[PDB]
Amino acid sequence: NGLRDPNTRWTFPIPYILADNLGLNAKGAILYAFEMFRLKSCVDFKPYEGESSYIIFQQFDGCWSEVGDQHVGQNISIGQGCAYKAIIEHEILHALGFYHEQSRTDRDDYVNIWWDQILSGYQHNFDTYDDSLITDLNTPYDYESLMHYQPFSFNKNASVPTITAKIPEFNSIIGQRLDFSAIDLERLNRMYNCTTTHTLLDHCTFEKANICGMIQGTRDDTDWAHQDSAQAGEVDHTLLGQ
Amino acid sequence: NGLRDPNTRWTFPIPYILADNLGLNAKGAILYAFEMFRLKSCVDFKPYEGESSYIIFQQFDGCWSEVGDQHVGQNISIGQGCAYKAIIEHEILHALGFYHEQSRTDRDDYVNIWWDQILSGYQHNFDTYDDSLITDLNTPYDYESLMHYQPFSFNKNASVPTITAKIPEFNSIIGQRLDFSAIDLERLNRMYNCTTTHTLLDHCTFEKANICGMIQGTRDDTDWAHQDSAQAGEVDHTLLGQCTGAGYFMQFSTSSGSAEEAALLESRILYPKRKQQCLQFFYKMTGSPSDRLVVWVRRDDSTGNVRKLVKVQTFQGDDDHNWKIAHVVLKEEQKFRYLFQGTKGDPQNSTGGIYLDDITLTETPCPTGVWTVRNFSQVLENTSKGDKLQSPRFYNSEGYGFGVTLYPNSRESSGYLRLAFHVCSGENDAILEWPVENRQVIITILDQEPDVRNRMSSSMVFTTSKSHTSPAINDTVIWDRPSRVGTYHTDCNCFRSIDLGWSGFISHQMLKRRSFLKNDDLIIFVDFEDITHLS
Amino acid sequence: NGLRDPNTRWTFPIPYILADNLGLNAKGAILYAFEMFRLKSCVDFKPYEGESSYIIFQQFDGCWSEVGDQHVGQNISIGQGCAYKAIIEHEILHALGFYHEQSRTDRDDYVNIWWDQILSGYQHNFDTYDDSLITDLNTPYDYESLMHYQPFSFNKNASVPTITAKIPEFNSIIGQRLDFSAIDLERLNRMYNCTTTHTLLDHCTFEKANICGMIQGTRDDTDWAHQDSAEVDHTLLGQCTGAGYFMQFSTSSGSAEEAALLESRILYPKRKQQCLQFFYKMTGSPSDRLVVWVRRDDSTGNVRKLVKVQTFQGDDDHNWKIAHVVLKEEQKFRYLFQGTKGDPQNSTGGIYLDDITLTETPCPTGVWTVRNFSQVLENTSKGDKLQSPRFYNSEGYGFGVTLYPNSRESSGYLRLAFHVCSGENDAILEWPVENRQVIITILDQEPDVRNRMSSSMVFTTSKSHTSPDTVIWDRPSRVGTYHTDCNCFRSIDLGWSGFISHQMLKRRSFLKNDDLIIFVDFEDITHLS
Amino acid sequence: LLSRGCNDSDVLAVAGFALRDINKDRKDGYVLRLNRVNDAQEYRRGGLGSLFYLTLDVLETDCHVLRKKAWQDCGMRIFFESVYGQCKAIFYMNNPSRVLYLAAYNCTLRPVSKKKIYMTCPDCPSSIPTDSSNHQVLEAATESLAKYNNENTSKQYSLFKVTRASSQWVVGPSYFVEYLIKESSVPVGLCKGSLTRTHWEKFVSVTCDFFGPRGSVQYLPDLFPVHLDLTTNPQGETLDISFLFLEPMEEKLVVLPFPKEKARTAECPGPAQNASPLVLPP
Numbered sequence A: 001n002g003l004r005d006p007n008t009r010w011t012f013p014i015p016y017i018l019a020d021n022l023g024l025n026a027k028g029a030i031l032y033a034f035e036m037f038r039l040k041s042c043v044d045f046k047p048y049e050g051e052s053s054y055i056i057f058q059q060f061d062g063c064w065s066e067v068g069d070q071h072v073g074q075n076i077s078i079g080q081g082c083a084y085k086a087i088i089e090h091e092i093l094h095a096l097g098f099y100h101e102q103s104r105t106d107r108d109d110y111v112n113i114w115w116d117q118i119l120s121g122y123q124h125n126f127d128t129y130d131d132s133l134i135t136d137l138n139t140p141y142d143y144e145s146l147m148h149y150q151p152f153s154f155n156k157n158a159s160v161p162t163i164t165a166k167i168p169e170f171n172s173i174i175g176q177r178l179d180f181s182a183i184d185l186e187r188l189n190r191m192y193n194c195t196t197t198h199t200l201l202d203h204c205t206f207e208k209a210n211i212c213g214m215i216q217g218t219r220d221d222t223d224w225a226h227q228d229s230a231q232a233g234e235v236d237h238t239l240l241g242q
Numbered sequence B: 001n002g003l004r005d006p007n008t009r010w011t012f013p014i015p016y017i018l019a020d021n022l023g024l025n026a027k028g029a030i031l032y033a034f035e036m037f038r039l040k041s042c043v044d045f046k047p048y049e050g051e052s053s054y055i056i057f058q059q060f061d062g063c064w065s066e067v068g069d070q071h072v073g074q075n076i077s078i079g080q081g082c083a084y085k086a087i088i089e090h091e092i093l094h095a096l097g098f099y100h101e102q103s104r105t106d107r108d109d110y111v112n113i114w115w116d117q118i119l120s121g122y123q124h125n126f127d128t129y130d131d132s133l134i135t136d137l138n139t140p141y142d143y144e145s146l147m148h149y150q151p152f153s154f155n156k157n158a159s160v161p162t163i164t165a166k167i168p169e170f171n172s173i174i175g176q177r178l179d180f181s182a183i184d185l186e187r188l189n190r191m192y193n194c195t196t197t198h199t200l201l202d203h204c205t206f207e208k209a210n211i212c213g214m215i216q217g218t219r220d221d222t223d224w225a226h227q228d229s230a231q232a233g234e235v236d237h238t239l240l241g242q243c244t245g246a247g248y249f250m251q252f253s254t255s256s257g258s259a260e261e262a263a264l265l266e267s268r269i270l271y272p273k274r275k276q277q278c279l280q281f282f283y284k285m286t287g288s289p290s291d292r293l294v295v296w297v298r299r300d301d302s303t304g305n306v307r308k309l310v311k312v313q314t315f316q317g318d319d320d321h322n323w324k325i326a327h328v329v330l331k332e333e334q335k336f337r338y339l340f341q342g343t344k345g346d347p348q349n350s351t352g353g354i355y356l357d358d359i360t361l362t363e364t365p366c367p368t369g370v371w372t373v374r375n376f377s378q379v380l381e382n383t384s385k386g387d388k389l390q391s392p393r394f395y396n397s398e399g400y401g402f403g404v405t406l407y408p409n410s411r412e413s414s415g416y417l418r419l420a421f422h423v424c425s426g427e428n429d430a431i432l433e434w435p436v437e438n439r440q441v442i443i444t445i446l447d448q449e450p451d452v453r454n455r456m457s458s459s460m461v462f463t464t465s466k467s468h469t470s471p472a473i474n475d476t477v478i479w480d481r482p483s484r485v486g487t488y489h490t491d492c493n494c495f496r497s498i499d500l501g502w503s504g505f506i507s508h509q510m511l512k513r514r515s516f517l518k519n520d521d522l523i524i525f526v527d528f529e530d531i532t533h534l535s
Numbered sequence C: 001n002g003l004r005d006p007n008t009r010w011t012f013p014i015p016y017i018l019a020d021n022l023g024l025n026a027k028g029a030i031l032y033a034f035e036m037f038r039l040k041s042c043v044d045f046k047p048y049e050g051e052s053s054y055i056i057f058q059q060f061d062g063c064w065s066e067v068g069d070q071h072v073g074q075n076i077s078i079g080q081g082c083a084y085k086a087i088i089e090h091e092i093l094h095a096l097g098f099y100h101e102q103s104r105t106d107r108d109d110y111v112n113i114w115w116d117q118i119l120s121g122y123q124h125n126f127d128t129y130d131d132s133l134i135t136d137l138n139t140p141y142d143y144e145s146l147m148h149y150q151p152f153s154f155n156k157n158a159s160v161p162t163i164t165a166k167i168p169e170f171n172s173i174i175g176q177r178l179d180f181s182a183i184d185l186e187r188l189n190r191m192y193n194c195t196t197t198h199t200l201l202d203h204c205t206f207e208k209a210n211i212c213g214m215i216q217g218t219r220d221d222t223d224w225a226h227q228d229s230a231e232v233d234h235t236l237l238g239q240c241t242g243a244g245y246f247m248q249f250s251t252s253s254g255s256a257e258e259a260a261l262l263e264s265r266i267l268y269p270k271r272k273q274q275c276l277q278f279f280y281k282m283t284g285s286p287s288d289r290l291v292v293w294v295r296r297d298d299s300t301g302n303v304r305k306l307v308k309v310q311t312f313q314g315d316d317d318h319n320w321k322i323a324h325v326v327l328k329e330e331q332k333f334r335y336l337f338q339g340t341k342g343d344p345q346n347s348t349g350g351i352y353l354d355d356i357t358l359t360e361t362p363c364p365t366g367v368w369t370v371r372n373f374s375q376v377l378e379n380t381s382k383g384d385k386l387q388s389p390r391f392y393n394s395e396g397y398g399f400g401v402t403l404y405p406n407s408r409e410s411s412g413y414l415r416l417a418f419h420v421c422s423g424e425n426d427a428i429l430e431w432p433v434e435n436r437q438v439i440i441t442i443l444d445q446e447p448d449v450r451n452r453m454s455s456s457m458v459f460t461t462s463k464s465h466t467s468p469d470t471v472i473w474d475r476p477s478r479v480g481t482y483h484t485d486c487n488c489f490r491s492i493d494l495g496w497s498g499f500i501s502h503q504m505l506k507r508r509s510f511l512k513n514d515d516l517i518i519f520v521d522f523e524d525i526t527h528l529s
Numbered sequence D: 001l002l003s004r005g006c007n008d009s010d011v012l013a014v015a016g017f018a019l020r021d022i023n024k025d026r027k028d029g030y031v032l033r034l035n036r037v038n039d040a041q042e043y044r045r046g047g048l049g050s051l052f053y054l055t056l057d058v059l060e061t062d063c064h065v066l067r068k069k070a071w072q073d074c075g076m077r078i079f080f081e082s083v084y085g086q087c088k089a090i091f092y093m094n095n096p097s098r099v100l101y102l103a104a105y106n107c108t109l110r111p112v113s114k115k116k117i118y119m120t121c122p123d124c125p126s127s128i129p130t131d132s133s134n135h136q137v138l139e140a141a142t143e144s145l146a147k148y149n150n151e152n153t154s155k156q157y158s159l160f161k162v163t164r165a166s167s168q169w170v171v172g173p174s175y176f177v178e179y180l181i182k183e184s185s186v187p188v189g190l191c192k193g194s195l196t197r198t199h200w201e202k203f204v205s206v207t208c209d210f211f212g213p214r215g216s217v218q219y220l221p222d223l224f225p226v227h228l229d230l231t232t233n234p235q236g237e238t239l240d241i242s243f244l245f246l247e248p249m250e251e252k253l254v255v256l257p258f259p260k261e262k263a264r265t266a267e268c269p270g271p272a273q274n275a276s277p278l279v280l281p282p
């Protein structure tokens, strides 16, 4: 679902303005979304200093972004309730050249669109783009994607889903608003050549015998066992003896 | 261990020259090492065409490289005996701005250097560097690093190591020369901003209910189950029942219904970068012998519509019910999807199904021959020193028949596996050129991990050569027509050449480590292809 | 019959537009007609890219073309029933600059026009032009010309011919729709300074002692004889004394596993795919093996990389058999024949090789040889039938043809009719199968393609083909009739009552060895939509 | 008839004045900005001025016509709800007499193309018809009005009509609207507002601003034909104009049939105020 043309790619840090029409709750939610980007990708943000393109975030009507870097600098809107971190993250993924997951070229292999159940005047929000416009980034269609729309989106009747997964399990999943999915990060990283997150400094689960390059001191008396999770109650926290 | 200064970086592809002082074997091995870079990283290489910086590869004294891009262009030496892919990968990692692992700033925390055991005047080869010269790329010290020196490096006494791990288990692992370590790829990717790699086009292990973006047909009859390994005696190949609630495979039952019912597992649309691919996968056919697993390719018709169908291969149920490896050569230059038609034959005579797991699609040649030994750990215990196993005869692109001899317990060294190539007589021999003069032999012990980047396979390389002779054949070339030179085997009704290859291709401890025996079985790839065109 | 004005000569490739008012069948049949031009002449065609003059092919009323290059570009009409190879070749020959053969200046010397039998308001359709407008290209009048009118053309009384040859035997021959005649190709060659074809890459009947520049291996045990028909060849069947030539590798003597390579000249493929046709016999042991190989370029300009491409074995049939091997060469190469002895003690014979032909085209998807076909015609009642073995297309659709050797519908005609067979793939294929162009071709069996005038009928499997009332091309297991004859559910058969007349089948080497060879293609043309 | 350039200094001013007259004439909808002159042609009559025939490209501004602003007093609307299109107008000019007059006009307008908006910004609130079939747009405007009545204790207001509407579904069904009101008259001001439901939290917002010739406007479905003639007569029509003059002296104007666009100059259409292919007319 990424915009193919490499000119549409930002160059980090994306300079940003927060407009003063934003509530405090929306300004703080934006900066919290930036921390998630910086924490899960090489995407970075800076305050504005006269750059040619930049995001201005706004409390305009609705919650929306142009897709990819418009080289004049661009609005994003964050209307009421879009203060939720995941909705900021979704709009910033549009700003980072990403279309909705149900707008993939291959989307019809994965999701039904119930055109008959869409509100008249809103069927075009389920358009799909050709592969000259968008890459797959060599990724599968992801139901867990933050870019996906939930089942009850643009529907005539509140009880009837506009969009459903052809693998029927995923009806209970599509359009999650938790966070980026693992494939949304995999895509974002393929799009921006990100190999290292700005804030994940280290992590370790000891699954490997080099213990994540920890060492044991010699000034101390003794050593910690690297323990195999095999004993009757003494399981690890990563796998819980699974 | 990376050279910090960003001026020392290459810009891909790295332009290169192979000097003619390289033997054909060395030229061929260098190209094979590039195919590993192109398969495990975004590193790429191009023939030289007038660039300011480039690598020239030459057979000088020993095997060495300057570190990072020297902007005037630079030598890599690959001296005699350095042809194995891991040594080339180690030198190319030096040209790609890496130092040895035991030269990290923090190395003293992870390894002991027994200075008094180092040969005099060789202490410097163990000089560490400071953090101004080098980044850790925010990665731990990796004993399994290809850059790490072997325990016996520059040592005075052949019984005594120069360098040992402070975690004593890694004494046995430091200076592995299988492949890139997982962390060496991580560091190379963090250095060169890689995320994709040029030659891994797809893979799937099914661990995710998304099934790797595979889809199920509707013009077929039924569906493959996304079968959970929880059912007794019915595990996946990725984890083989190691994880509860979490091994997955596709399963097409053939035990019930009509004959010739089918289900088309269909992959997501793929955009090949090369003219050839190898779809590898693991499968079972425990159902009827008339069951067919057929692999199909749905390809673009040039209108942007992936609807055209091409049957590429068929598999059928032998008496072996255990997880088999498959390879299918695909030849897709246009967007395509790989497909698996499961097909029921005689459900009245099926008690099982067709199964899939551990799918891997690389934009490479396939292994020319593929040999699997069942219950290897049990073979390896039961077999005496100097006993042998022989691979079934395989035919190369040119039609030369060949096989590998595996001697599970090497008589030449305890705790080593000896693995040796031979030409077999075969149906084509009467028209082929003899002796084999320039056919490179690559033997690989597959690390059975679906993601190629995770894999650290072991591989040894030689080129059949005029110099290869024995008194046992009156000092004539080993590669001459096997009827004239080889020895007869009713074991396949073949002659087989004298067998050349390595006592201690790999050690038993090294084979046990890295889960090479994933199912307790052993999978050996062989390639055998003419490299004359590199002369 | 060529337009004299040299300003009217196209410069190749002719850029073309296939207008979307053409049915899929017409689009595919026009692309098939272009292949015949590229295979028999230096004429070539390209998709349109803004050129000044070009041909736009359109489904208008009937079949017609302006004659020669109109420098602003021009129409060709291909209406209902107009979408057959020879009819398209006729209209493209008009655009290339040819008039009808009976419009020759000297036509009166060769034909009678029965003016009184022409429809009123059609008299000018039989006009003849002076030698200022036209050119004979210094060629005789050709009764066999594709540009010639059929005898019953534009007649009042359907029983009565409008046009007849003065030599009365040619009246049956005139107005042939098999394809271009030798003279038509010769006139085309002279008009466009053609010297060779684009997709005839090689051919060899061995009639010349240099064996078409073929060479024998030294990295083998033995050689093929260049055998003299003193037991005969396939090009002449022993019709001419002392000139029948064919390569023969005897397997009745020596050890088994003994072999000989025969290798072609080095050949420079202009396309990615070629078809190596040949005729062969394997009168020797069942274990003898005729293996076709390619010695291709090893990428250093040295033709040495072997690739085994196909093996042929010996059946009880020891008559000349037609082979095809798809080659996929994009770099210079030799095609090779490894003849191999298996069990010489149980060979009384050998392997044979004649009439090799290499074209830069797809191979025929299915190929059926009906033996002793004159005998079949003498044996077989009207409405009795024969059915091909079950071919499979590139997509895996199982298919075959029905032959009614004496048509029930009229005396002295074949009916050939395609049908879709059930096959091992059907459960995954789409149904009905449609947009799949069937081409049925009776092979003419000249070893030189330019000499060949194969008869070919084309149609596209379609939704409109429904038999009272589901599409005939729907899945054979549920709309086909079962056959114990191959364990196949063959479908309802569609094709042509009168594909060719017996009296035309007697001529042109359609039955060259007293046997009939039918090619079939059954290929998806949905990508032309 | 003289074809004239769209960048000509007289034609540019005349088009602005004509568009301002159209905005003043309009009893409902919004003040239109002149994106550019699109064609211009002139009938010449010696000393007593000329008759101009103009084709325009135009955009909808942020001001309703009951506010009575000129279009230079008004901002550019947001891209995701821009209304765009074309006008034909007939206009007499005589600068020596200081006489200028819009004779007649017709205009065709559209909301910006819904596909081209989606492609530019997938989450942008897509614009929709304001008629009473959309119950939920009426709920949005009446909820925002109820919030305004609850916020403003001095006076209470009632819905006259809904003038613009759009919606988005990301956080949930989210409607955005503009509408007219009167106290509890000619409509007294333009309201702007919204209604949004999540599954749990709900939001409403509101802000409100308190404030013949032959011709027409039509709002069509999205992807510009314009029917206009005061006469069919090839001689033209001797239409009275005496009432335009400060002393209403006996004066009549020969209105020729509207000059066809086949007579366009290479100086037409002109330079645009907003050249974006979303909202620049064909």
Ligand SMILES: *[C@@H]1O[C@H](CO[C@@H]2O[C@@H](C)[C@@H](O)[C@@H](O)[C@@H]2O)[C@@H](O[C@@H]2O[C@H](CO)[C@@H](O[C@@H]3O[C@H](CO)[C@@H](O)[C@H](O)[C@@H]3O)[C@H](O)[C@H]2NC(C)=O)[C@H](O)[C@H]1NC(C)=O
Binding pocket: B285, B286, B287, B288, B289, B317, B319, B346, B349, B350, B351, B352
């Ligand atoms: C039914 O299918 C079995 C094999 O399939 C297995 O058994 C079914 C009952 C179901 O449980 C299936 O799900 C399951 O996979 C056929 O048995 C096999 O037949 C072949 C051919 O006769 C035997 O092969 C031969 O084996 C000898 C050595 O033993 C070789 O020398 C020969 O060259 C050849 O390979 C094979 O041994 C045999 N296997 C077993 C386990 O019996 C069975 O014939 C079939 N029955 C019918 C009526 O279809």
Ligand SMILES: *[C@@H]1O[C@H](CO[C@@H]2O[C@@H](C)[C@@H](O)[C@@H](O)[C@@H]2O)[C@@H](O[C@@H]2O[C@H](CO)[C@@H](O[C@@H]3O[C@H](CO)[C@@H](O)[C@H](O)[C@@H]3O)[C@H](O)[C@H]2NC(C)=O)[C@H](O)[C@H]1NC(C)=O
Binding pocket: C282, C283, C284, C285, C286, C314, C316, C343, C346, C347, C348, C349, C350
């Ligand atoms: C020796 O080779 C013959 C066939 O080859 C022919 O005879 C040799 C002696 C030489 O003269 C060759 O130059 C010549 O080409 C073998 O005979 C054939 O064996 C096959 C297999 O059994 C038979 O096929 C079967 O036939 C029946 C009908 O009879 C069918 O129903 C079956 O489906 C199947 O096709 C074939 O008929 C038979 N042909 C003849 C003419 O006998 C022979 O087996 C072989 N012997 C040895 C010991 O190698």
Ligand SMILES: *[C@@H]1O[C@H](CO)[C@@H](O[C@@H]2O[C@H](CO)[C@@H](O[C@@H]3O[C@H](CO)[C@@H](O)[C@H](O)[C@H]3NC(C)=O)[C@H](O)[C@H]2NC(C)=O)[C@H](O)[C@H]1NC(C)=O
Binding pocket: A006, A009, A010, A191, A192, A193, B042
């Ligand atoms: C992420 O990494 C990508 C490589 O994996 C980068 O892609 C390369 O970007 C180059 C420009 O920065 C491209 O060069 C251009 O190539 C085209 C022909 O394809 C030429 O016409 C242009 O003139 C040339 N531009 C210049 C200035 O020379 C590379 O072709 C391109 N390579 C590939 C494989 O796409 C991405 O730029 C990078 N993206 C980010 C945001 O980091």
Ligand SMILES: *[C@@H]1O[C@H](CO)[C@@H](O[C@@H]2O[C@H](CO)[C@@H](O[C@@H]3O[C@H](CO)[C@@H](O)[C@H](O)[C@H]3NC(C)=O)[C@H](O)[C@H]2NC(C)=O)[C@H](O)[C@H]1NC(C)=O
Binding pocket: A042, B006, B009, B010, B191, B192, B193
């Ligand atoms: C891997 O990705 C890195 C970003 O994550 C790239 O690092 C950036 O490269 C820029 C040049 O392409 C550097 O800009 C230059 O910085 C120096 C000071 O370091 C200035 O003197 C130069 O003026 C400036 N260039 C220009 C044109 O002004 C960035 O500083 C640098 N950023 C960081 C954080 O390192 C790597 O280049 C890239 N490497 C590879 C091998 O792909």
Ligand SMILES: *[C@@H]1O[C@H](CO)[C@@H](O[C@@H]2O[C@H](CO)[C@@H](O)[C@H](O)[C@H]2NC(C)=O)[C@H](O)[C@H]1NC(C)=O
Binding pocket: A156, A157, A158, A159, A160
């Ligand atoms: C919304 O959709 C539901 C399901 O299609 C409709 O519910 C049914 O309505 C009929 C009357 O029209 C009842 O007899 C059924 O019992 C209802 N089914 C259920 C599951 O409750 C509902 O009417 C629709 N509402 C609107 C406004 O469209």
Ligand SMILES: *[C@@H]1O[C@H](CO)[C@@H](O[C@@H]2O[C@H](CO)[C@@H](O)[C@H](O)[C@H]2NC(C)=O)[C@H](O)[C@H]1NC(C)=O
Binding pocket: B157, B158, B159, B160
């Ligand atoms: C090399 O190292 C080995 C192992 O430490 C040395 O072996 C010792 O040799 C002496 C006799 O010379 C024996 O008494 C010891 O028992 C051996 N030790 C072991 C552990 O086996 C060897 O001498 C060293 N040689 C040199 C030249 O350094």
Ligand SMILES: *[C@@H]1O[C@H](CO)[C@@H](O[C@@H]2O[C@H](CO)[C@@H](O)[C@H](O)[C@H]2NC(C)=O)[C@H](O)[C@H]1NC(C)=O
Binding pocket: C056, C060, C072, C073, C074, C075
């Ligand atoms: C092909 O033939 C058609 C007529 O069947 C030509 O179309 C006509 O062209 C003239 C001149 O432009 C028009 O006045 C007619 O209205 C057209 N008629 C139709 C039915 O379209 C067409 O121009 C010809 N094209 C060429 C290249 O010869």
Ligand SMILES: *[C@@H]1O[C@H](CO)[C@@H](O[C@@H]2O[C@H](CO)[C@@H](O)[C@H](O)[C@H]2NC(C)=O)[C@H](O)[C@H]1NC(C)=O
Binding pocket: C157, C158, C159, C160
């Ligand atoms: C078409 O030509 C045939 C042959 O010349 C005509 O057939 C003859 O018709 C007359 C009656 O009009 C019969 O008495 C003759 O016996 C027929 N002769 C033959 C050979 O059958 C036929 O009349 C013509 N028909 C038309 C419509 O012109």
Ligand SMILES: *[C@@H]1O[C@H](CO)[C@@H](O[C@@H]2O[C@H](CO)[C@@H](O)[C@H](O)[C@H]2NC(C)=O)[C@H](O)[C@H]1NC(C)=O
Binding pocket: A056, A072, A073, A074, A075, D074, D075, D076, D077, D078
């Ligand atoms: C964000 O969108 C607003 C429109 O809502 C743009 O602001 C308009 O800009 C033009 C040109 O200066 C003015 O004519 C309008 O009066 C402005 N309207 C408002 C409400 O301010 C703004 O320029 C856009 N900004 C970016 C960075 O895209």
Ligand SMILES: *[C@@H]1O[C@H](CO)[C@@H](O)[C@H](O)[C@H]1NC(C)=O
Binding pocket: B374, B375
């Ligand atoms: C492998 O070992 C098992 C016992 O654990 C035995 O049942 C099986 O037959 C063996 N398979 C082979 C091929 O030796």
Ligand SMILES: *[C@@H]1O[C@H](CO)[C@@H](O)[C@H](O)[C@H]1NC(C)=O
Binding pocket: C371, C372, C375
């Ligand atoms: C063909 O005719 C010959 C006689 O000339 C006869 O011997 C042979 O059996 C016939 N073969 C077939 C296949 O009809």
Ligand SMILES: [Ca+2]
Binding pocket: A216, A217, A218, A219, A220, A221, A222, A223, A224
């Ligand atoms: Ca300690």
Ligand SMILES: [Ca+2]
Binding pocket: B216, B217, B218, B219, B220, B221, B222, B223, B224, B263, B264
């Ligand atoms: Ca299915």
Ligand SMILES: [Ca+2]
Binding pocket: B205, B206, B207, B236, B237, B238, B239, B247, B248, B249, B357, B358
């Ligand atoms: Ca698995």
Ligand SMILES: [Ca+2]
Binding pocket: C205, C206, C207, C233, C234, C235, C236, C244, C245, C246, C354, C355
């Ligand atoms: Ca011959």
Ligand SMILES: [Ca+2]
Binding pocket: C216, C217, C218, C219, C220, C221, C222, C223, C224, C260, C261
């Ligand atoms: Ca020879």
